[PDB]
PDB file of C-alpha atoms in Angstrom:
ATOM      1  CA  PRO A  92      81.665 160.380  90.515  1.00  0.00           C
ATOM      2  CA  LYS A  93      85.017 158.808  90.429  1.00  0.00           C
ATOM      3  CA  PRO A  94      86.581 155.771  92.490  1.00  0.00           C
ATOM      4  CA  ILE A  95      87.218 156.806  96.117  1.00  0.00           C
ATOM      5  CA  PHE A  96      90.781 156.605  97.547  1.00  0.00           C
ATOM      6  CA  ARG A  97      91.291 157.291 101.290  1.00  0.00           C
ATOM      7  CA  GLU A  98      94.446 157.419 103.355  1.00  0.00           C
ATOM      8  CA  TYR A  99      94.883 157.663 107.133  1.00  0.00           C
ATOM      9  CA  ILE A 100      97.532 160.194 108.320  1.00  0.00           C
ATOM     10  CA  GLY A 101      98.622 161.610 111.677  1.00  0.00           C
ATOM     11  CA  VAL A 102      97.759 158.363 113.546  1.00  0.00           C
ATOM     12  CA  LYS A 103     101.402 157.532 114.517  1.00  0.00           C
ATOM     13  CA  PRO A 104     102.356 160.544 116.684  1.00  0.00           C
ATOM     14  CA  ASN A 105     105.862 159.158 117.425  1.00  0.00           C
ATOM     15  CA  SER A 106     106.779 158.510 113.773  1.00  0.00           C
ATOM     16  CA  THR A 107     109.164 160.876 111.979  1.00  0.00           C
ATOM     17  CA  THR A 108     108.834 159.273 108.529  1.00  0.00           C
ATOM     18  CA  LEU A 109     106.817 162.178 107.071  1.00  0.00           C
ATOM     19  CA  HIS A 110     107.203 165.912 107.512  1.00  0.00           C
ATOM     20  CA  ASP A 111     104.116 166.907 105.581  1.00  0.00           C
ATOM     21  CA  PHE A 112     101.167 165.380 103.674  1.00  0.00           C
ATOM     22  CA  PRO A 113     102.671 163.220 100.895  1.00  0.00           C
ATOM     23  CA  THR A 114     101.872 164.405  97.348  1.00  0.00           C
ATOM     24  CA  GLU A 115     103.044 161.201  95.627  1.00  0.00           C
ATOM     25  CA  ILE A 116      99.753 159.421  96.190  1.00  0.00           C
ATOM     26  CA  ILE A 117      97.629 162.436  95.466  1.00  0.00           C
ATOM     27  CA  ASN A 118      95.579 161.907  92.340  1.00  0.00           C
ATOM     28  CA  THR A 119      92.555 164.051  91.830  1.00  0.00           C
ATOM     29  CA  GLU A 120      92.287 163.547  88.061  1.00  0.00           C
ATOM     30  CA  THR A 121      91.153 159.884  88.020  1.00  0.00           C
ATOM     31  CA  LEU A 122      90.192 159.474  91.705  1.00  0.00           C
ATOM     32  CA  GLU A 123      88.308 161.224  94.437  1.00  0.00           C
ATOM     33  CA  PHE A 124      91.105 161.569  97.019  1.00  0.00           C
ATOM     34  CA  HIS A 125      90.617 161.799 100.768  1.00  0.00           C
ATOM     35  CA  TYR A 126      93.106 162.341 103.631  1.00  0.00           C
ATOM     36  CA  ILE A 127      91.669 160.995 106.961  1.00  0.00           C
ATOM     37  CA  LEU A 128      93.448 163.049 109.648  1.00  0.00           C
ATOM     38  CA  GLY A 129      93.488 161.631 112.966  1.00  0.00           C
ATOM     39  CA  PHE A 130      93.143 160.960 116.104  1.00  0.00           C
ATOM     40  CA  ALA A 131      90.898 163.465 117.849  1.00  0.00           C
ATOM     41  CA  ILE A 132      90.761 161.601 121.285  1.00  0.00           C
ATOM     42  CA  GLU A 133      88.612 162.211 124.363  1.00  0.00           C
ATOM     43  CA  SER A 134      89.901 162.865 127.845  1.00  0.00           C
ATOM     44  CA  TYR A 135      89.005 160.123 130.344  1.00  0.00           C
ATOM     45  CA  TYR A 136      88.201 160.275 134.047  1.00  0.00           C
ATOM     46  CA  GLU A 137      90.273 158.083 136.466  1.00  0.00           C
ATOM     47  CA  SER A 138      87.537 155.439 136.238  1.00  0.00           C
ATOM     48  CA  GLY A 139      88.451 154.970 132.525  1.00  0.00           C
ATOM     49  CA  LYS A 140      85.153 156.543 131.408  1.00  0.00           C
ATOM     50  CA  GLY A 141      85.065 159.166 128.667  1.00  0.00           C
ATOM     51  CA  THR A 142      84.154 162.828 129.177  1.00  0.00           C
ATOM     52  CA  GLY A 143      83.240 163.499 125.531  1.00  0.00           C
ATOM     53  CA  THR A 144      85.807 166.368 125.481  1.00  0.00           C
ATOM     54  CA  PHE A 145      87.979 165.832 122.370  1.00  0.00           C
ATOM     55  CA  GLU A 146      91.476 167.100 121.733  1.00  0.00           C
ATOM     56  CA  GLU A 147      93.802 166.736 118.690  1.00  0.00           C
ATOM     57  CA  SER A 148      96.374 163.945 119.200  1.00  0.00           C
ATOM     58  CA  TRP A 149      98.189 164.232 115.860  1.00  0.00           C
ATOM     59  CA  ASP A 150     101.377 166.313 115.491  1.00  0.00           C
ATOM     60  CA  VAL A 151     100.171 169.877 114.820  1.00  0.00           C
ATOM     61  CA  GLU A 152     103.615 171.095 113.598  1.00  0.00           C
ATOM     62  CA  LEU A 153     103.514 168.497 110.776  1.00  0.00           C
ATOM     63  CA  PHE A 154      99.758 168.192 110.078  1.00  0.00           C
ATOM     64  CA  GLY A 155      98.247 171.274 111.760  1.00  0.00           C
ATOM     65  CA  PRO A 156      96.160 174.124 110.358  1.00  0.00           C
ATOM     66  CA  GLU A 157      98.992 175.793 108.410  1.00  0.00           C
ATOM     67  CA  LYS A 158      99.891 172.469 106.671  1.00  0.00           C
ATOM     68  CA  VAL A 159      96.212 171.745 105.855  1.00  0.00           C
ATOM     69  CA  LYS A 160      95.907 175.320 104.395  1.00  0.00           C
ATOM     70  CA  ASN A 161      98.963 174.689 102.154  1.00  0.00           C
ATOM     71  CA  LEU A 162      97.692 171.283 101.008  1.00  0.00           C
ATOM     72  CA  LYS A 163      94.290 172.744 100.079  1.00  0.00           C
ATOM     73  CA  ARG A 164      95.858 175.763  98.302  1.00  0.00           C
ATOM     74  CA  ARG A 165      97.817 173.384  96.060  1.00  0.00           C
ATOM     75  CA  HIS A 166      95.206 170.593  95.726  1.00  0.00           C
ATOM     76  CA  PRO A 167      91.737 172.062  96.328  1.00  0.00           C
ATOM     77  CA  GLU A 168      89.941 168.866  95.237  1.00  0.00           C
ATOM     78  CA  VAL A 169      91.430 166.721  98.050  1.00  0.00           C
ATOM     79  CA  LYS A 170      88.904 166.185 100.897  1.00  0.00           C
ATOM     80  CA  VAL A 171      90.174 166.314 104.496  1.00  0.00           C
ATOM     81  CA  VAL A 172      88.113 164.508 107.206  1.00  0.00           C
ATOM     82  CA  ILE A 173      88.875 164.157 110.965  1.00  0.00           C
ATOM     83  CA  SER A 174      88.809 160.736 112.625  1.00  0.00           C
ATOM     84  CA  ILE A 175      87.684 160.381 116.270  1.00  0.00           C
ATOM     85  CA  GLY A 176      88.169 157.553 118.778  1.00  0.00           C
ATOM     86  CA  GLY A 177      91.469 155.693 118.672  1.00  0.00           C
ATOM     87  CA  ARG A 178      92.881 152.191 118.418  1.00  0.00           C
ATOM     88  CA  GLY A 179      94.221 151.598 121.937  1.00  0.00           C
ATOM     89  CA  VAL A 180      92.458 149.661 124.709  1.00  0.00           C
ATOM     90  CA  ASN A 181      93.048 152.943 126.616  1.00  0.00           C
ATOM     91  CA  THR A 182      90.617 154.869 124.327  1.00  0.00           C
ATOM     92  CA  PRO A 183      87.377 152.860 124.504  1.00  0.00           C
ATOM     93  CA  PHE A 184      83.883 154.200 123.811  1.00  0.00           C
ATOM     94  CA  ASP A 185      82.395 154.244 127.364  1.00  0.00           C
ATOM     95  CA  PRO A 186      80.735 157.546 128.325  1.00  0.00           C
ATOM     96  CA  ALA A 187      80.683 158.528 132.005  1.00  0.00           C
ATOM     97  CA  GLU A 188      77.325 160.405 131.576  1.00  0.00           C
ATOM     98  CA  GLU A 189      75.037 159.566 128.653  1.00  0.00           C
ATOM     99  CA  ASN A 190      73.045 162.792 128.664  1.00  0.00           C
ATOM    100  CA  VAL A 191      76.064 165.163 128.806  1.00  0.00           C
ATOM    101  CA  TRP A 192      78.488 163.201 126.512  1.00  0.00           C
ATOM    102  CA  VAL A 193      76.889 164.431 123.320  1.00  0.00           C
ATOM    103  CA  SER A 194      77.021 168.128 124.259  1.00  0.00           C
ATOM    104  CA  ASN A 195      80.733 167.954 125.205  1.00  0.00           C
ATOM    105  CA  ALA A 196      81.560 166.032 121.961  1.00  0.00           C
ATOM    106  CA  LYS A 197      79.648 168.459 119.715  1.00  0.00           C
ATOM    107  CA  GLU A 198      81.279 171.515 121.327  1.00  0.00           C
ATOM    108  CA  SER A 199      84.855 170.216 121.527  1.00  0.00           C
ATOM    109  CA  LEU A 200      84.825 168.806 117.959  1.00  0.00           C
ATOM    110  CA  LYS A 201      83.379 172.061 116.582  1.00  0.00           C
ATOM    111  CA  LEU A 202      86.207 173.959 118.327  1.00  0.00           C
ATOM    112  CA  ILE A 203      88.818 171.685 116.676  1.00  0.00           C
ATOM    113  CA  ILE A 204      87.175 171.857 113.231  1.00  0.00           C
ATOM    114  CA  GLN A 205      87.025 175.686 113.356  1.00  0.00           C
ATOM    115  CA  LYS A 206      90.866 175.862 113.622  1.00  0.00           C
ATOM    116  CA  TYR A 207      91.121 174.351 110.087  1.00  0.00           C
ATOM    117  CA  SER A 208      89.952 177.381 108.128  1.00  0.00           C
ATOM    118  CA  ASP A 209      91.294 179.751 105.467  1.00  0.00           C
ATOM    119  CA  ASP A 210      90.120 183.113 104.041  1.00  0.00           C
ATOM    120  CA  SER A 211      87.621 181.221 101.931  1.00  0.00           C
ATOM    121  CA  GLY A 212      86.010 178.992 104.573  1.00  0.00           C
ATOM    122  CA  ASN A 213      86.366 175.766 106.493  1.00  0.00           C
ATOM    123  CA  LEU A 214      88.818 173.167 105.183  1.00  0.00           C
ATOM    124  CA  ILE A 215      87.258 170.076 106.821  1.00  0.00           C
ATOM    125  CA  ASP A 216      84.760 168.073 104.715  1.00  0.00           C
ATOM    126  CA  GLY A 217      83.629 165.394 107.181  1.00  0.00           C
ATOM    127  CA  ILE A 218      84.161 163.086 110.120  1.00  0.00           C
ATOM    128  CA  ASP A 219      85.242 159.436 110.513  1.00  0.00           C
ATOM    129  CA  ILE A 220      84.183 157.285 113.482  1.00  0.00           C
ATOM    130  CA  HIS A 221      87.031 155.021 114.505  1.00  0.00           C
ATOM    131  CA  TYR A 222      86.614 153.612 117.983  1.00  0.00           C
ATOM    132  CA  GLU A 223      88.171 150.088 118.000  1.00  0.00           C
ATOM    133  CA  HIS A 224      86.991 149.126 121.542  1.00  0.00           C
ATOM    134  CA  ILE A 225      83.224 149.300 122.134  1.00  0.00           C
ATOM    135  CA  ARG A 226      81.710 146.796 124.641  1.00  0.00           C
ATOM    136  CA  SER A 227      77.996 146.906 123.648  1.00  0.00           C
ATOM    137  CA  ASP A 228      75.621 148.061 120.936  1.00  0.00           C
ATOM    138  CA  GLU A 229      74.193 150.692 123.233  1.00  0.00           C
ATOM    139  CA  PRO A 230      74.520 153.737 124.140  1.00  0.00           C
ATOM    140  CA  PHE A 231      76.964 153.656 121.197  1.00  0.00           C
ATOM    141  CA  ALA A 232      74.346 153.625 118.410  1.00  0.00           C
ATOM    142  CA  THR A 233      72.151 156.252 120.127  1.00  0.00           C
ATOM    143  CA  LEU A 234      74.900 158.697 121.229  1.00  0.00           C
ATOM    144  CA  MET A 235      77.008 158.332 118.011  1.00  0.00           C
ATOM    145  CA  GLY A 236      73.758 158.713 116.013  1.00  0.00           C
ATOM    146  CA  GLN A 237      72.907 161.971 117.844  1.00  0.00           C
ATOM    147  CA  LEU A 238      76.468 163.347 117.414  1.00  0.00           C
ATOM    148  CA  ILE A 239      76.367 162.721 113.611  1.00  0.00           C
ATOM    149  CA  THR A 240      72.890 164.387 113.423  1.00  0.00           C
ATOM    150  CA  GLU A 241      74.007 167.462 115.411  1.00  0.00           C
ATOM    151  CA  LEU A 242      77.210 167.964 113.323  1.00  0.00           C
ATOM    152  CA  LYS A 243      75.404 167.501 109.976  1.00  0.00           C
ATOM    153  CA  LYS A 244      72.751 170.050 111.064  1.00  0.00           C
ATOM    154  CA  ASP A 245      75.257 172.728 112.160  1.00  0.00           C
ATOM    155  CA  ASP A 246      75.226 175.399 109.396  1.00  0.00           C
ATOM    156  CA  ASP A 247      78.636 176.728 110.601  1.00  0.00           C
ATOM    157  CA  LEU A 248      80.266 173.448 109.486  1.00  0.00           C
ATOM    158  CA  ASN A 249      80.594 171.526 106.221  1.00  0.00           C
ATOM    159  CA  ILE A 250      80.213 167.948 107.485  1.00  0.00           C
ATOM    160  CA  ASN A 251      79.454 166.453 104.136  1.00  0.00           C
ATOM    161  CA  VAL A 252      81.203 163.079 104.212  1.00  0.00           C
ATOM    162  CA  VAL A 253      80.545 160.733 107.147  1.00  0.00           C
ATOM    163  CA  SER A 254      82.271 157.353 107.546  1.00  0.00           C
ATOM    164  CA  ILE A 255      82.591 154.512 110.036  1.00  0.00           C
ATOM    165  CA  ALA A 256      85.538 152.146 110.441  1.00  0.00           C
ATOM    166  CA  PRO A 257      84.495 148.665 111.593  1.00  0.00           C
ATOM    167  CA  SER A 258      86.628 145.518 112.085  1.00  0.00           C
ATOM    168  CA  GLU A 259      85.400 141.975 112.420  1.00  0.00           C
ATOM    169  CA  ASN A 260      85.300 142.191 116.249  1.00  0.00           C
ATOM    170  CA  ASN A 261      83.270 145.414 116.572  1.00  0.00           C
ATOM    171  CA  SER A 262      81.153 145.101 113.366  1.00  0.00           C
ATOM    172  CA  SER A 263      77.910 144.271 115.229  1.00  0.00           C
ATOM    173  CA  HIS A 264      78.039 147.626 117.111  1.00  0.00           C
ATOM    174  CA  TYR A 265      78.739 149.545 113.886  1.00  0.00           C
ATOM    175  CA  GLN A 266      75.857 147.711 112.122  1.00  0.00           C
ATOM    176  CA  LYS A 267      73.456 148.944 114.819  1.00  0.00           C
ATOM    177  CA  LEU A 268      74.628 152.512 114.128  1.00  0.00           C
ATOM    178  CA  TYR A 269      74.595 152.116 110.370  1.00  0.00           C
ATOM    179  CA  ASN A 270      71.013 150.754 110.391  1.00  0.00           C
ATOM    180  CA  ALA A 271      69.733 153.680 112.424  1.00  0.00           C
ATOM    181  CA  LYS A 272      71.609 156.399 110.463  1.00  0.00           C
ATOM    182  CA  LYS A 273      71.982 154.869 106.970  1.00  0.00           C
ATOM    183  CA  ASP A 274      71.050 158.096 105.295  1.00  0.00           C
ATOM    184  CA  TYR A 275      73.878 160.126 106.956  1.00  0.00           C
ATOM    185  CA  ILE A 276      76.699 157.580 106.611  1.00  0.00           C
ATOM    186  CA  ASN A 277      78.347 157.654 103.195  1.00  0.00           C
ATOM    187  CA  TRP A 278      81.162 155.171 103.673  1.00  0.00           C
ATOM    188  CA  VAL A 279      81.777 151.936 105.606  1.00  0.00           C
ATOM    189  CA  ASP A 280      85.587 151.465 105.742  1.00  0.00           C
ATOM    190  CA  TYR A 281      86.118 147.796 106.655  1.00  0.00           C
ATOM    191  CA  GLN A 282      89.675 146.854 107.688  1.00  0.00           C
ATOM    192  CA  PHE A 283      90.633 143.431 106.212  1.00  0.00           C
ATOM    193  CA  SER A 284      93.952 143.372 108.163  1.00  0.00           C
ATOM    194  CA  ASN A 285      91.893 142.944 111.412  1.00  0.00           C
ATOM    195  CA  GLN A 286      90.074 139.689 110.450  1.00  0.00           C
ATOM    196  CA  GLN A 287      90.065 136.950 113.078  1.00  0.00           C
ATOM    197  CA  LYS A 288      91.131 134.109 110.794  1.00  0.00           C
ATOM    198  CA  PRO A 289      93.419 134.648 107.763  1.00  0.00           C
ATOM    199  CA  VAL A 290      91.963 135.471 104.332  1.00  0.00           C
ATOM    200  CA  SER A 291      93.707 132.857 102.245  1.00  0.00           C
ATOM    201  CA  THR A 292      92.494 133.255  98.728  1.00  0.00           C
ATOM    202  CA  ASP A 293      91.115 135.917  96.425  1.00  0.00           C
ATOM    203  CA  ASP A 294      87.872 133.901  96.406  1.00  0.00           C
ATOM    204  CA  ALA A 295      87.727 134.047 100.289  1.00  0.00           C
ATOM    205  CA  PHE A 296      88.214 137.831  99.972  1.00  0.00           C
ATOM    206  CA  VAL A 297      85.350 138.229  97.495  1.00  0.00           C
ATOM    207  CA  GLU A 298      83.028 136.138  99.633  1.00  0.00           C
ATOM    208  CA  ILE A 299      83.800 138.322 102.665  1.00  0.00           C
ATOM    209  CA  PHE A 300      83.115 141.490 100.718  1.00  0.00           C
ATOM    210  CA  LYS A 301      79.717 140.298  99.450  1.00  0.00           C
ATOM    211  CA  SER A 302      78.634 139.469 103.018  1.00  0.00           C
ATOM    212  CA  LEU A 303      79.706 142.985 104.130  1.00  0.00           C
ATOM    213  CA  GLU A 304      77.390 144.548 101.482  1.00  0.00           C
ATOM    214  CA  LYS A 305      74.524 142.467 102.933  1.00  0.00           C
ATOM    215  CA  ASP A 306      75.466 143.584 106.508  1.00  0.00           C
ATOM    216  CA  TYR A 307      75.674 147.287 105.471  1.00  0.00           C
ATOM    217  CA  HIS A 308      74.685 148.156 101.926  1.00  0.00           C
ATOM    218  CA  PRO A 309      75.941 147.449  98.367  1.00  0.00           C
ATOM    219  CA  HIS A 310      78.363 149.990  96.979  1.00  0.00           C
ATOM    220  CA  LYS A 311      78.946 151.734 100.353  1.00  0.00           C
ATOM    221  CA  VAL A 312      81.646 149.358 101.630  1.00  0.00           C
ATOM    222  CA  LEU A 313      85.312 150.202 100.941  1.00  0.00           C
ATOM    223  CA  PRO A 314      87.828 147.398 101.646  1.00  0.00           C
ATOM    224  CA  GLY A 315      90.960 148.450 103.580  1.00  0.00           C
ATOM    225  CA  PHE A 316      94.525 147.193 104.071  1.00  0.00           C
ATOM    226  CA  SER A 317      97.103 147.960 106.783  1.00  0.00           C
ATOM    227  CA  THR A 318     100.853 148.535 106.131  1.00  0.00           C
ATOM    228  CA  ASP A 319     101.468 149.041 109.897  1.00  0.00           C
ATOM    229  CA  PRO A 320     104.098 146.549 111.189  1.00  0.00           C
ATOM    230  CA  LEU A 321     101.854 145.704 114.227  1.00  0.00           C
ATOM    231  CA  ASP A 322      99.243 144.556 111.704  1.00  0.00           C
ATOM    232  CA  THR A 323     101.794 142.972 109.328  1.00  0.00           C
ATOM    233  CA  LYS A 324     102.902 140.655 112.215  1.00  0.00           C
ATOM    234  CA  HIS A 325      99.315 139.424 112.768  1.00  0.00           C
ATOM    235  CA  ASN A 326      99.385 138.223 109.095  1.00  0.00           C
ATOM    236  CA  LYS A 327      95.587 138.039 108.561  1.00  0.00           C
ATOM    237  CA  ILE A 328      95.953 139.091 104.923  1.00  0.00           C
ATOM    238  CA  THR A 329      98.970 139.589 102.633  1.00  0.00           C
ATOM    239  CA  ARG A 330      99.293 142.421 100.117  1.00  0.00           C
ATOM    240  CA  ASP A 331      99.207 139.759  97.363  1.00  0.00           C
ATOM    241  CA  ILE A 332      95.751 138.528  98.426  1.00  0.00           C
ATOM    242  CA  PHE A 333      94.496 142.140  98.939  1.00  0.00           C
ATOM    243  CA  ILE A 334      95.581 143.092  95.408  1.00  0.00           C
ATOM    244  CA  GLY A 335      94.195 139.783  93.983  1.00  0.00           C
ATOM    245  CA  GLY A 336      90.836 140.149  95.772  1.00  0.00           C
ATOM    246  CA  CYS A 337      90.459 143.827  94.662  1.00  0.00           C
ATOM    247  CA  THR A 338      91.293 142.759  91.061  1.00  0.00           C
ATOM    248  CA  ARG A 339      88.333 140.332  91.072  1.00  0.00           C
ATOM    249  CA  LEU A 340      86.040 143.130  92.295  1.00  0.00           C
ATOM    250  CA  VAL A 341      87.258 145.586  89.680  1.00  0.00           C
ATOM    251  CA  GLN A 342      86.590 142.947  86.955  1.00  0.00           C
ATOM    252  CA  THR A 343      82.850 142.897  87.778  1.00  0.00           C
ATOM    253  CA  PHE A 344      82.747 146.676  88.345  1.00  0.00           C
ATOM    254  CA  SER A 345      81.966 146.127  92.037  1.00  0.00           C
ATOM    255  CA  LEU A 346      84.728 148.083  93.882  1.00  0.00           C
ATOM    256  CA  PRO A 347      83.693 151.663  94.728  1.00  0.00           C
ATOM    257  CA  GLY A 348      87.146 152.511  96.125  1.00  0.00           C
ATOM    258  CA  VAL A 349      89.587 151.513  98.923  1.00  0.00           C
ATOM    259  CA  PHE A 350      91.304 152.926 102.022  1.00  0.00           C
ATOM    260  CA  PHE A 351      94.724 152.446 103.609  1.00  0.00           C
ATOM    261  CA  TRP A 352      95.962 152.357 107.131  1.00  0.00           C
ATOM    262  CA  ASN A 353      98.690 154.435 107.131  1.00  0.00           C
ATOM    263  CA  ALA A 354     100.710 157.043 105.286  1.00  0.00           C
ATOM    264  CA  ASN A 355     103.507 156.951 107.919  1.00  0.00           C
ATOM    265  CA  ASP A 356     103.934 153.166 107.626  1.00  0.00           C
ATOM    266  CA  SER A 357     103.694 152.930 103.817  1.00  0.00           C
ATOM    267  CA  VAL A 358     106.622 155.337 103.120  1.00  0.00           C
ATOM    268  CA  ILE A 359     109.094 152.712 104.358  1.00  0.00           C
ATOM    269  CA  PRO A 360     109.594 149.691 102.087  1.00  0.00           C
ATOM    270  CA  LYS A 361     109.287 146.263 103.736  1.00  0.00           C
ATOM    271  CA  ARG A 362     111.010 144.142 101.062  1.00  0.00           C
ATOM    272  CA  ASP A 363     114.211 145.436  99.472  1.00  0.00           C
ATOM    273  CA  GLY A 364     113.439 146.989  96.119  1.00  0.00           C
ATOM    274  CA  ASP A 365     109.922 148.071  97.090  1.00  0.00           C
ATOM    275  CA  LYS A 366     109.102 151.696  96.230  1.00  0.00           C
ATOM    276  CA  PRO A 367     107.428 153.902  98.896  1.00  0.00           C
ATOM    277  CA  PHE A 368     103.562 153.544  98.774  1.00  0.00           C
ATOM    278  CA  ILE A 369     103.799 150.418  96.550  1.00  0.00           C
ATOM    279  CA  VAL A 370     100.376 149.034  97.684  1.00  0.00           C
ATOM    280  CA  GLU A 371      98.593 152.393  97.331  1.00  0.00           C
ATOM    281  CA  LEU A 372     100.034 153.101  93.765  1.00  0.00           C
ATOM    282  CA  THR A 373      99.157 149.549  92.634  1.00  0.00           C
ATOM    283  CA  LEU A 374      95.498 150.081  93.774  1.00  0.00           C
ATOM    284  CA  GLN A 375      95.392 153.491  92.016  1.00  0.00           C
ATOM    285  CA  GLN A 376      96.563 151.837  88.760  1.00  0.00           C
ATOM    286  CA  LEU A 377      93.798 149.174  89.022  1.00  0.00           C
ATOM    287  CA  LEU A 378      91.056 151.737  89.930  1.00  0.00           C
ATOM    288  CA  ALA A 379      91.810 153.890  86.804  1.00  0.00           C
ATOM    289  CA  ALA A 380      92.703 151.214  84.156  1.00  0.00           C
TER     290      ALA A 380
END
């Protein structure tokens, strides 16, 4: 329908800035709103190779099943998706056994997903693939492809929205996956804060975006921004250029939506006088108007 708005949450397990899912950014009247809950992370053997057995790594007191139930009781139109992988160098995609990885991943993720249920059914609407560190195109595209297929085919689940989260440095591996499974992947969430060289103008932004649509597919790419201080320090893109660049896209009716990296980091103003969620609220204003 509507412009898509997605926000990562739960990804800073040591942060105490939030004690529940924020309602300030929730807008289901003019936008299609998604919370991306993560990280479901695999256990690794001593060799640094992944087992495919996922566990929740977010705070379950703050964002667990009872909090998801409450959110959905109050705002039924919000979609909740689980993100798997992780950003550390300590959570790479590197399966120890290629023919057993997929069965462990399907079973362990289904177990997690089944915890997020109410009297009327499952509360999870999809999955997000967010492995930052992937060394080669393969077995990634084959194994991730099979996992998506198995989850979408399970009638016990409602895995309706599938997304991937590439960055400039891992984009080639995600492109391999996207080409093979184009029909099951709804959204490509590309993080502009992870570019190698700085994005200096709104024209440089626009030019990057168009090339992403060629690499993936027109209207399936959602530009993203990071309010995380680790990313702010890298200074690959400023909020002024991000807003400017998105404005240009909105003017030619070419922006399908946006995503933000992360609710914990956006609640705390960076410049005195800044309101909490200033970048998110500014993008919501431009997506409606």
